[PDB]
Each structure stands twice: as C-alpha cells, then as structure tokens.
Amino acid sequence: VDEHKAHKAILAYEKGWLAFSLAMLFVFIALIAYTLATHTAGVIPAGKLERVDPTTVRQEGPWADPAQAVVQTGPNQYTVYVLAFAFGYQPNPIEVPQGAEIVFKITSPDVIHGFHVEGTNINVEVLPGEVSTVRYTFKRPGEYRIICNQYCGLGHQNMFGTIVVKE
Amino acid sequence: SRVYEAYPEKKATLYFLVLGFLALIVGSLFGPFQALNYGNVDAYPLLKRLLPFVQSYYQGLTLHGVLNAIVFTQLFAQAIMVYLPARELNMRPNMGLMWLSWWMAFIGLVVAALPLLANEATVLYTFYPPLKGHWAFYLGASVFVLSTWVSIYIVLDLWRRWKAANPGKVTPLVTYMAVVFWLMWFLASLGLVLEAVLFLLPWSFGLVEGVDPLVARTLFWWTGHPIVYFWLLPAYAIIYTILPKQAGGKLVSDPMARLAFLLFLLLSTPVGFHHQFADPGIDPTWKMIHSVLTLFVAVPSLMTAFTVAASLEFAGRLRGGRGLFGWIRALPWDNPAFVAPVLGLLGFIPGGAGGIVNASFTLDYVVHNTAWVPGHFHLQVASLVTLTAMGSLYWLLPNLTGKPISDAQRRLGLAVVWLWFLGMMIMAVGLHWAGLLNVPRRAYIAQVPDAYPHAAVPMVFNVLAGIVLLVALLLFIYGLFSVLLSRERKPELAEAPLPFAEVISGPEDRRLVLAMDRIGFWFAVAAILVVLAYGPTLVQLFGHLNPVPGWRLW
Amino acid sequence: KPKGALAVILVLTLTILVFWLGVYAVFFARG
Ligand code: HAS
Ligand code: HEM
Ligand SMILES: CCCCCCCC/C=C\CCCCCCCC(=O)OC[C@H](O)CO
Ligand code: CUA
Ligand SMILES: [Cu+2]
Structure with missing residues (x-):
C-alpha cells in the first residue's frame, strides 16, 4: 500500500x-x-623525525649564518636553511635560481609558524625542535611572498618573507 | 511545581540548555567584529570602549572559539542526548549524577573563564604548545570536558535498567542513537584527556620545563576530529526522530537511521591526521590511510541526505504537494521548528563539499590555514548545529517550563533563522573566495590594510555578513529573553509528550536492527580501529620526545 | 519513486564535483 x-x-x-x-x-x-x-x-x-634544539639553532649549525643558508647539494639542486621566528623569516630575501629543485629545511626557535608561499602549494607548519623539509621547483622568475598562516602571537598579521627567483 | 517533582529531569535539562545559550550569546558578540575584520574594516577600537577587558583581536577570537564551539555545543549535547532517551523510555535518570554533571560543567566554565577574561590564555581554542596559557585555563577546560563522562554513565545506566526489564527487546531508536553517541565520545575524548594529564597540566604548573609540540598536536587531533561529530549528532537525532513529525510526515526507515549512527561510532575517531597533512615527522603512508578513512566517514552523511530528503518529500506529498518541486511548497514554512533545521541542511550541501576537498591529502595544501577553513566550518557548526538548536526552543522550552510561545514570538523566530542562515551563506562566499586568494585564517588583517588588495570584492561580502549577523544576533537576544522572562505559564504544556515521529516499517527491519544492537561487539571494533590508526605513530613519537620551552607572545 | 529526494542528491553530487575538480585544477596550476 x-x-x-x-x-x-x-x-x-x-x-x-x-x-x-x-x-x-x-x-x-x-x-x-x-x-x-x-x-x-x-x-x-618528510616523514623523518629530524630533531634540533631550538635554544641553539641561532648560534650553531646551518641556521646560524643566514648569508650561507643557500647550499648547492646537487647539479640542479639547492638546499635552503630557513628560520621562521617571532616575527619574520631568515634569510630575507631567499634568492634561488629558476628551474632548480629547492629543498627547504625550515625550523622555529620559539613557537609554531606557518610557511605558505603565495602562488605555490608550499604550505607547511613549522614546529620548534623539528625540521620541516619540502621541495619545489620554481618555473617562473619574480618575487614570491611568504605568509605566516599559523597564529604565533600579537605580531602574526605582519609576519611576511620574500623569495626572489632569478632568471 | 508538582511537574518538577514527578519529572525533575526537566529542570536539570533546562539548566544545561540556558547555560549553553548564554555561552552562545557572549561568544557570538565577537563574530560580527571578526567578519568586519575579514572585510578590511577595523571596528576593535569601538569594541574596546564597550568591553574594556578586551586587549586584542586574538583574545576576542579565543573567547569566540571556546564559548561557541566548546561550551555551547557540549551543553546542548548534554541536554538533548540525556533528556530525549529518558522521555522515550519514560524512565528517570540518576538525578544525583545529573546535578553533579551540571555543577562540574558550571565550575569548569567559571575557572577556565577567569584567565581568558584577564588576558592570561590568548592561545585560541586549539591552545597549541609552546604557547603557554595560565594553569586555570587547562584545569577549567579539563573539568568542563570530564562532566561528559558522568553524562555517559547516566545514559548507559538508563539503557541497562531498560534492557533488564525488557529482555529480548531491541533498543528503542532514540536510546540506540544516544548509546552509540556516548560510547563514540568516550573513545574520542581520550586524546585530549591524555594531552591534559601527561603534558599541559604539569607543564602549566611548572612541574616539567617543556612539551613536545608534535606529540601534543597528535593527541589533540585524536579528540579534535570526533568532537565535531559530537557537536553534529544531537542535531541529527532531532532531524531523524522529531523533524519528520513537524513536517507532517514519518521517518521512512528506522534501520538506515541506526546504520548512519553505527558508522559514526566506527569512523569518527581514527581520522585526525587529516588535521596534520602539513605537519612534519608523520609518515605520508599514515596521512593517506587517515585521508581514506576520512572519505569513508562522509558516507553516513551522504546516507543522511537521502533518508532525510525522502522523509521531507513524503511529508510534502501527504500535505498535497504534486510534481518534482510542489512537495517543497506544501511543507510548513510558517513553523520555525521546521524552517531552522531545513535551512541548516541546505547550507550543509556546500559545507560537506568543502569538507571532502579538505580530506583529500594533497588538495589540502591549497586551502590549509586560509580563510577557506572558517568558511567550511561556519556552514557545518555555526549554521546546521546552531539553527537546529535555535529551532528546538519552539517545542523544547514549553515542554520544560510550561511557558507558551505567542504568534508574535513565532514570527520573530522566523525572521531570526532566515537572517542567521542568509548571513552565514554570504560570509561563506566571502571566506571561501578570500581563502583561494591565500588570505590566512586567525589574522587581524584589518591592521595591514594594503596586504591583500586582490581580495577587495570578497571583503565586501564579509562586511555585509557582519551587519546581517549583528541584526540576527540582537533579534535572537530579544526573542530568547521575551520567552524566559514571560510570566504566563500553562503546566499542561510541561506534561505534553515530545513530538517524536512515527516510523514506516518493512519486513527487512527486524534482522538488520538485531545485528546493529550488538553494541559490545561494535564498540570493540571501534576501539581496535583507534589502536591501529594511532598506535604505530604514537610509539614512534613517544620514543623520540623533544620537549621545548614555553612562550608568552601577547 | 522518490523523485524529489533524487533531485536533492543530484544537486549535492554536482556541488561535490564542482568543489573537488575546481580545487584539483588549482593544485596542478600551482604545482
Ligand atoms: C559540525 C562541525 C563539522 C562537520 C559536520 C564537519 C564535516 C567534515 N569536515 Fe570539517 N574539516 C575537514 C573535513 C571534513 C569532512 C570530510 C566532513 C564530512 O563529515 C562532511 C560530510 C557531509 C556531507 C557529504 C553533506 C551531506 C549533506 C546533507 C546531509 C544535506 C542534505 C540536505 C537536505 C536533505 C535538505 C533538502 C531540503 C529541501 C527542502 C530541498 C578537514 C580535512 O579533512 C579539515 C582540516 C582542513 C585544514 O586544512 O585545517 C576540517 C576542518 C574543520 C574545522 C576547523 C578545525 C580547526 O580549527 O583547525 C571545524 C571546526 C570543522 C567542523 C566540521 N566539519 N571542520
Ligand atoms: C554571528 C555569528 C558569527 C560570526 C559573524 C562569525 C564570524 C567568524 C569569523 C569571521 C571567524 C574567523 C576569524 C579568524 O580566522 O581570524 C570565526 C572563527 C570561528 N568561529 Fe565564528 N562567527 C559566528 C558564530 C559562530 C558560531 C555559532 C560558532 C560555533 C558554534 C563559531 C565558531 C567559530 C570557530 C570555532 C572559529 C575559529 C576560531 C579559531 O581559529 O581559533 N562561530 N567566526
Ligand atoms: C562505467 C565507467 C567505468 C570507468 C570510469 C572511470 C573514471 C576514471 C576517472 C579518473 C581518471 C584517472 C586518470 C588520472 C590521470 C590524471 C591526469 C591529469 O590530471 O593530468 C593533468 C596534470 O597536468 C598531469 O600532470
Ligand atoms: Cu608566525 Cu603567525
Ligand atoms: Cu576533522
């Protein structure tokens, strides 16, 4: 029925x-x-746990001299040691060649930050005591803005960096 | 009242509901100011003259998240999912435990509220270490959430007293929903309880020097996914078992309602790495496993869409609507208890679509931590769950208080739910679109007015939503206080039965309901899925703890 | 047949597909 x-x-x-x-x-x-x-x-x-001491990363090792943060590790490969901190990025700017594989190794000496490169799929949380490793190849030269997209304290909305991709 | 001596559960239920709606009102006052901010309009100088304890945008955002998403939703869940089963079974809850539950929630709220108001815990509703809040925040929040463990016992007690008196009978439908809801939440809650007892509380008291933020996030998001199914299921319980009666119809299937609830028991907890796609030090294989289980937890909502739609279509045809669309106009659009949850379900279509994108591993790198994510979740919790809770006051408040709703209060209710719905849809357009333009969430962007010039058009939407939702909030405050401060009472409305729907039965129903009534078996399976999904990563992380110092950056 | 319920799940399905294929396209454009 x-x-x-x-x-x-x-x-x-x-x-x-x-x-x-x-x-x-x-x-x-x-x-x-x-x-x-x-x-x-x-x-x-990278899934690998790669532990660092946030209290010494500004004084010893590959984050301590931002002017030597860009290292050729391969014939068309560069590794960049990036510090995200309250409230900025080092080095500033990050300078890399178009067409190369870039391996970003990002850490924090203080609190969690975001590392989001406008116009790309690079969008990674940065934990103090840990290294976040991501890779990308820039196909277009120009200036790309880094945005902090994790709440890090009162300076958060002004936390920006710069990548310049050279021809 | 003689009412409350026979049915004292009515007065305890009322104390949960009112404390929840007070939390919703205070939390929501920050909402319009945050929407204006995402429209590039800084109204905080004005808010600080009216509430001079507000020191920052981020203190407001902490109060907004805590009071709306943690306090209001929990107290609504505790009211509905204890009272509805009690009334279905016509049995009294343990009133000693019910009052204890309430006092735990009230004392936890007061203790957590103090450092929030004094600017000592501006860490947001996720409180990610190493941002270090005041110990009273972690202690208060701990006690608040543990009140739900008493709730769980109260319902399991009701169920085992009914079963002992009715050997061989299947669990009745509403009590079935509440039992697997509360057992789900027990499993879900353990992440946050473990994070609080092993890490946040000792750290906050100065008994350990640091916390491992990757451990803390992992334990947080164990609870952090299923807490949103905890918010949702009391709305679904009303939408399955009460809304069909208010529409003029029947629930078309008891078994497909039970099956939706059973799939939530199994699939709500073991999914949390979908909040950790962008986290280091979690194996991509485990992220892919959580993303597949997350796509499966969508199935019970895809099923709900069909079962609910078919029941509203049934009601509409029985009310004389003809053709592919005439069933819609025959429904009771003059009844706010009907309209509110149905507009909520409409916004849940795009809300659910955004959720499935978010779940799809690599697609999350497009949207993670942008305005997209608040655009998604306002359609889910701030519209479906909140509108369903607002609509329930048209049948629940007379049933608890004996206070009638005037024809004028009914019409004001209709204006409130339409403006709330329309404001949420407009804000959804603004935030989804700003998100695709890389605008970050959790950001006082109105303080850097030249930083996002590409978002000028979606920002106009966020300004409009802020104004529409400000009006909806003020009309809601006026309506709610007009009914609670009304002197007229008619005790025969406090004695009337709840408007539970009838069900259409089929030959299938008995054999599928008894397989789903094996609750001990299904709980065992749900527990095992949590062990398999979390266990191997947690042994990894706990083996390699790297605790770091706390910071105050506010 | 529940033709009204079918029209609802048709609009749900199209919304899911537009959301999902739209963001898939954005991911490859940014890749
Ligand atoms: C109540 C609250 C919520 C519900 C429900 C919800 C559902 C989903 N979500 Fe979500 N969510 C995510 C994935 C999902 C998925 C796969 C679903 C699914 O459960 C959704 C399934 C729903 C459907 C498939 C819709 C079915 C449609 C129905 C039932 C309507 C039918 C209409 C009818 C019948 C009306 C017809 C009537 C007529 C008259 C025509 C992911 C990732 O995978 C993230 C992290 C993203 C990031 O990067 O941070 C996320 C983030 C959040 C956050 C932010 C947390 C934070 O602060 O960081 C919140 C608060 C939240 C809430 C909620 N979310 N979500
Ligand atoms: C008048 C109503 C509301 C308006 C205009 C509104 C507006 C907003 C806006 C614009 C944000 C984003 C702020 C940011 O990312 O910086 C936000 C965040 C949020 N809202 Fe609402 N909201 C309202 C009501 C609600 C309700 C009812 C709920 C829950 C039941 C809710 C839960 C949240 C949550 C959980 C957050 C995120 C907090 C965080 O990121 O830490 N909102 N709201
Ligand atoms: C009854 C019919 C049964 C069969 C129906 C099956 C539906 C197939 C669906 C998806 C195709 C998957 C192919 C994946 C190819 C992806 C290619 C792509 O996206 O390429 C763009 C990008 O630029 C590359 O780098
Ligand atoms: Cu660094 Cu926000
Ligand atoms: Cu989730």
Whole structure:
C-alpha cells in the first residue's frame, strides 16, 4: 500500500545512491594516488623525525649564518636553511635560481609558524625542535611572498618573507 | 511545581540548555567584529570602549572559539542526548549524577573563564604548545570536558535498567542513537584527556620545563576530529526522530537511521591526521590511510541526505504537494521548528563539499590555514548545529517550563533563522573566495590594510555578513529573553509528550536492527580501529620526545 | 519513486564535483 510502496521504492533508490557514492569516493582516491606519483608530491613534508634544539639553532649549525643558508647539494639542486621566528623569516630575501629543485629545511626557535608561499602549494607548519623539509621547483622568475598562516602571537598579521627567483 | 517533582529531569535539562545559550550569546558578540575584520574594516577600537577587558583581536577570537564551539555545543549535547532517551523510555535518570554533571560543567566554565577574561590564555581554542596559557585555563577546560563522562554513565545506566526489564527487546531508536553517541565520545575524548594529564597540566604548573609540540598536536587531533561529530549528532537525532513529525510526515526507515549512527561510532575517531597533512615527522603512508578513512566517514552523511530528503518529500506529498518541486511548497514554512533545521541542511550541501576537498591529502595544501577553513566550518557548526538548536526552543522550552510561545514570538523566530542562515551563506562566499586568494585564517588583517588588495570584492561580502549577523544576533537576544522572562505559564504544556515521529516499517527491519544492537561487539571494533590508526605513530613519537620551552607572545 | 529526494542528491553530487575538480585544477596550476 502507499506507505509500504513508498518504503520499498525509497530503499531501492537508496541502495543505488550508496553504490554511486562509494564509486565516486573510490575515483577521488585514485586521483589523489596519482598526485603522490608526480613531482607535485614534493610539497608533502618528510616523514623523518629530524630533531634540533631550538635554544641553539641561532648560534650553531646551518641556521646560524643566514648569508650561507643557500647550499648547492646537487647539479640542479639547492638546499635552503630557513628560520621562521617571532616575527619574520631568515634569510630575507631567499634568492634561488629558476628551474632548480629547492629543498627547504625550515625550523622555529620559539613557537609554531606557518610557511605558505603565495602562488605555490608550499604550505607547511613549522614546529620548534623539528625540521620541516619540502621541495619545489620554481618555473617562473619574480618575487614570491611568504605568509605566516599559523597564529604565533600579537605580531602574526605582519609576519611576511620574500623569495626572489632569478632568471 | 508538582511537574518538577514527578519529572525533575526537566529542570536539570533546562539548566544545561540556558547555560549553553548564554555561552552562545557572549561568544557570538565577537563574530560580527571578526567578519568586519575579514572585510578590511577595523571596528576593535569601538569594541574596546564597550568591553574594556578586551586587549586584542586574538583574545576576542579565543573567547569566540571556546564559548561557541566548546561550551555551547557540549551543553546542548548534554541536554538533548540525556533528556530525549529518558522521555522515550519514560524512565528517570540518576538525578544525583545529573546535578553533579551540571555543577562540574558550571565550575569548569567559571575557572577556565577567569584567565581568558584577564588576558592570561590568548592561545585560541586549539591552545597549541609552546604557547603557554595560565594553569586555570587547562584545569577549567579539563573539568568542563570530564562532566561528559558522568553524562555517559547516566545514559548507559538508563539503557541497562531498560534492557533488564525488557529482555529480548531491541533498543528503542532514540536510546540506540544516544548509546552509540556516548560510547563514540568516550573513545574520542581520550586524546585530549591524555594531552591534559601527561603534558599541559604539569607543564602549566611548572612541574616539567617543556612539551613536545608534535606529540601534543597528535593527541589533540585524536579528540579534535570526533568532537565535531559530537557537536553534529544531537542535531541529527532531532532531524531523524522529531523533524519528520513537524513536517507532517514519518521517518521512512528506522534501520538506515541506526546504520548512519553505527558508522559514526566506527569512523569518527581514527581520522585526525587529516588535521596534520602539513605537519612534519608523520609518515605520508599514515596521512593517506587517515585521508581514506576520512572519505569513508562522509558516507553516513551522504546516507543522511537521502533518508532525510525522502522523509521531507513524503511529508510534502501527504500535505498535497504534486510534481518534482510542489512537495517543497506544501511543507510548513510558517513553523520555525521546521524552517531552522531545513535551512541548516541546505547550507550543509556546500559545507560537506568543502569538507571532502579538505580530506583529500594533497588538495589540502591549497586551502590549509586560509580563510577557506572558517568558511567550511561556519556552514557545518555555526549554521546546521546552531539553527537546529535555535529551532528546538519552539517545542523544547514549553515542554520544560510550561511557558507558551505567542504568534508574535513565532514570527520573530522566523525572521531570526532566515537572517542567521542568509548571513552565514554570504560570509561563506566571502571566506571561501578570500581563502583561494591565500588570505590566512586567525589574522587581524584589518591592521595591514594594503596586504591583500586582490581580495577587495570578497571583503565586501564579509562586511555585509557582519551587519546581517549583528541584526540576527540582537533579534535572537530579544526573542530568547521575551520567552524566559514571560510570566504566563500553562503546566499542561510541561506534561505534553515530545513530538517524536512515527516510523514506516518493512519486513527487512527486524534482522538488520538485531545485528546493529550488538553494541559490545561494535564498540570493540571501534576501539581496535583507534589502536591501529594511532598506535604505530604514537610509539614512534613517544620514543623520540623533544620537549621545548614555553612562550608568552601577547 | 522518490523523485524529489533524487533531485536533492543530484544537486549535492554536482556541488561535490564542482568543489573537488575546481580545487584539483588549482593544485596542478600551482604545482
Ligand atoms: C559540525 C562541525 C563539522 C562537520 C559536520 C564537519 C564535516 C567534515 N569536515 Fe570539517 N574539516 C575537514 C573535513 C571534513 C569532512 C570530510 C566532513 C564530512 O563529515 C562532511 C560530510 C557531509 C556531507 C557529504 C553533506 C551531506 C549533506 C546533507 C546531509 C544535506 C542534505 C540536505 C537536505 C536533505 C535538505 C533538502 C531540503 C529541501 C527542502 C530541498 C578537514 C580535512 O579533512 C579539515 C582540516 C582542513 C585544514 O586544512 O585545517 C576540517 C576542518 C574543520 C574545522 C576547523 C578545525 C580547526 O580549527 O583547525 C571545524 C571546526 C570543522 C567542523 C566540521 N566539519 N571542520
Ligand atoms: C554571528 C555569528 C558569527 C560570526 C559573524 C562569525 C564570524 C567568524 C569569523 C569571521 C571567524 C574567523 C576569524 C579568524 O580566522 O581570524 C570565526 C572563527 C570561528 N568561529 Fe565564528 N562567527 C559566528 C558564530 C559562530 C558560531 C555559532 C560558532 C560555533 C558554534 C563559531 C565558531 C567559530 C570557530 C570555532 C572559529 C575559529 C576560531 C579559531 O581559529 O581559533 N562561530 N567566526
Ligand atoms: C562505467 C565507467 C567505468 C570507468 C570510469 C572511470 C573514471 C576514471 C576517472 C579518473 C581518471 C584517472 C586518470 C588520472 C590521470 C590524471 C591526469 C591529469 O590530471 O593530468 C593533468 C596534470 O597536468 C598531469 O600532470
Ligand atoms: Cu608566525 Cu603567525
Ligand atoms: Cu576533522
């Protein structure tokens, strides 16, 4: 009858919707897996735990001299040691060549910061005592702004840096 | 009243609801000022003349997040998911424990509130170390949240007293929802309890010198995902079991409602790395595993969409609506208890779509920590959950107090829910669009007025929303106090039954309900999924602790 | 048949697809 007809017809269509639903979610998983097998995957932070002492990173080791923070580690590869701190980035600016693989190694001497490079997929949290490692290749020369996008205290809204990508 | 001697659970429920709506009012006063800020308009000089204890944008944002997303939502969950099962079973909760629950929540709130008002815990509702708040904040928040463990016991007690008196009977539908809701929350709560007892409390008291921020975030987001299902499920309970009656219809399936709730018990907790896609020192394989489980936790809401839609269509046809769209106009759009949750469900369509993008691992690098994320979650908690809670006052407050709602109060209610809904949709456009233009969340951007020139158009939307939602808030305050400070009482409305829906039954129903009634089995499975999803990363992290000093940067 | 409920899940499905393919496109443009 009409309530029992309704109920049978409602459940029949709900079974199809649920099968379509799973099919769609499975296609999204396939399209995500594809991103993991391309160069676009370098913006995923390294899983390795790489521990540092935030109390000495400004006095000893590769963050202590910002003018020597850009190191050639490969024939078309540079590693950049970046400090995010209350309230700025060192070095400033970061100067790198177009077309090279850049390995950013970012740490904090104080609180958590963001490292978000406007126009790119570089978007990583920076934890004191830990190194966040991301890689990217800049295809276009010019100036790219670094935005701090994790609340770090009262100076947060003014915490900006600069990458200059040279031809 | 003779009412409260027979049904004292009515007065305890009322104390939860009112304390929650007071928290919502105070938290929401900061909302319009934050929307004006995301429109490049600095109104904080004016707010500081009216509330001179406010020292900063970020102290306001801390009060906003804590009072709206932690305090209001918890106290609503505690009111609905203890009272509705009690009334369905026609049984009295342990009133000693129910009053204890309330006093824990009230004392936790007062203790946490003190350092928040005095500018000693401007760390936001996520309180990520090494930003170091006052010990009273962590202690107060700890006690507030643990009040829910008493809630859990009260409902498990109700269920086992009913089962002992009805051997061989299946759990009734509302009590079933509340049981798997409270068992889910027990598992969910353990991350934050562990973060508080092992780390934040001893650190805050000066008994350890530092905390490992990667450990703290990992334990936080154990609780931090499922707390949003904790906010949602009491709204879903009303939308499944009460809204169909208010629409003029019936719930079309008891089993597909139970199954949605069972999938939330299983899939709500083991998902938290979707908040940690951009964190160092978590293996990308585990991030992919959490992103797949996150896509699965969407399924019970995709199912809810179909079950609810089919039940509203049924009600509309029974009320004489014809064709593909005439069922919509036949629904009772004059009844605020109907309109509020339905507008909430409409905004939840784009809200849910944003959630699925956020879950998809590498796509999160586009949106993480931008204005996109507040755009997403205002459609989920600030619209669906809050509008459902506002609508429930049209049937729940007469049922607890015997105070009637005038025709004039009804019409004012309709204006409030329409303006709240429209303001949230307008703000959603502004924040999603600003987010795609790289505008950060959690930022006093009105203090750097030339930094985001590309966002001038979406900023106009955020100004409009701020004004519309300011008006909605003032009308809501006036309406709520007109009903609570009204002198007229009619005790036969306090004795009336709750408007529970009837269900359409089918031959299938009995065999699927008894498999889902094996609650001990399904709880075991949910617990095992948490161990597998978290255990291997936590042994990694705890093996390699790197605690760091605390900072005050405000 | 629940034709009204079908029209609702059609609009839900199109919203999900527009959101998801739109952001997928942005991710590769920024990549
Ligand atoms: C109540 C509160 C919330 C709900 C519900 C919610 C749902 C989801 N979320 Fe979320 N969320 C994320 C993923 C999801 C996913 C996959 C879902 C899913 O559960 C959503 C599924 C929903 C659906 C698939 C919608 C179904 C539609 C329905 C049911 C409506 C039907 C309409 C009808 C029937 C009306 C018809 C009637 C007529 C009359 C026509 C992710 C990542 O994966 C992040 C981190 C992002 C980052 O980078 O920080 C995130 C961030 C947040 C934050 C910020 C935390 C912070 O401060 O950092 C909050 C507060 C929040 C709340 C909530 N969120 N979320
Ligand atoms: C009049 C109502 C409201 C308006 C105009 C509004 C506006 C805003 C805005 C613009 C933000 C973003 C601020 C930023 O990122 O710097 C925000 C944050 C937030 N809002 Fe609302 N809001 C309102 C009501 C609510 C309600 C009802 C809830 C929850 C039930 C809520 C929960 C939140 C949360 C959790 C945050 C994030 C806090 C954080 O990042 O630490 N809001 N609100
Ligand atoms: C009944 C029908 C059954 C079968 C239906 C299956 C649907 C297939 C869906 C997705 C294709 C996945 C292919 C992935 C290719 C991605 C290519 C891409 O996105 O390329 C742009 C980018 O520039 C590259 O670097
Ligand atoms: Cu550094 Cu915000
Ligand atoms: Cu989550």
